[PDB]
Amino acid sequence: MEERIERIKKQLHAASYKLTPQREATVRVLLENEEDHLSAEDVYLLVKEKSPEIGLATVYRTLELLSELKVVDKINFGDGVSRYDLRQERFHHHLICTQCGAVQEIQEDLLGEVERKVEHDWSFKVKDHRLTFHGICKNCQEN
């Protein structure tokens, strides 16, 4: 058992960096969309646009492996879906449509006035800030 512990160990560790081309495909779809903030639905459907023998559960397990091993980050921005964004590694803003899933980054920094107010009001030294907005987007208001 004591060495069976070991056998299993090296099984698991192998399973973590040894990448099947099934896993490798989920990674391809991540690298091919860095700015984009992809859901499990998303990464799935795009893996099928090259290798559709894949299986959704495979795609999920792979993502869930990456996020453990701090290569991607699960995030919930509050649209009620966990999104897997890579960490190639003020942070920008997001508008996330709670229907058509349309993301839009805001390049500007609209906080300013708020950032300062906080500081005064709480005696807090701001360094970084991450804002996400929820609302069915321009195009869905017309379709």
Next chain:
Amino acid sequence: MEERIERIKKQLHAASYKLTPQREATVRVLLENEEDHLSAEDVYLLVKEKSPEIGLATVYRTLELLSELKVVDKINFGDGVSRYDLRQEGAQRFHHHLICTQCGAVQEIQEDLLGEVERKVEHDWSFKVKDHRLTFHGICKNCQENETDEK
């Protein structure tokens, strides 16, 4: 077929006022600790302190259903742990947080400081905002004055 669906409807209604006791157990733990932001694991522990004939799956499934219903909100903090944040009742926008990147204090902000800004994004990007999630990161008030006793 539509008969079978109605049957299924009656099925679930039973299961539900069958299952509410373990629902109430979990909703307690949340309410008792609104200042904390509990991970599912956390809840689980606190619920066997009263109702340990519970099992973990029924707690999670409750937690998820409750964030389905906006009653609570799932939140990572950079610590790679999904945590269930209770929304103050009747609120229209989720609270803000100040996180400390050191000591790790978390301050819910009950006011809504993004009003003028909501109005700007709604304008500039022809968007219809229905909620938001704002978080700041920064060494907090007391960590300014306890690393002025450590240099």
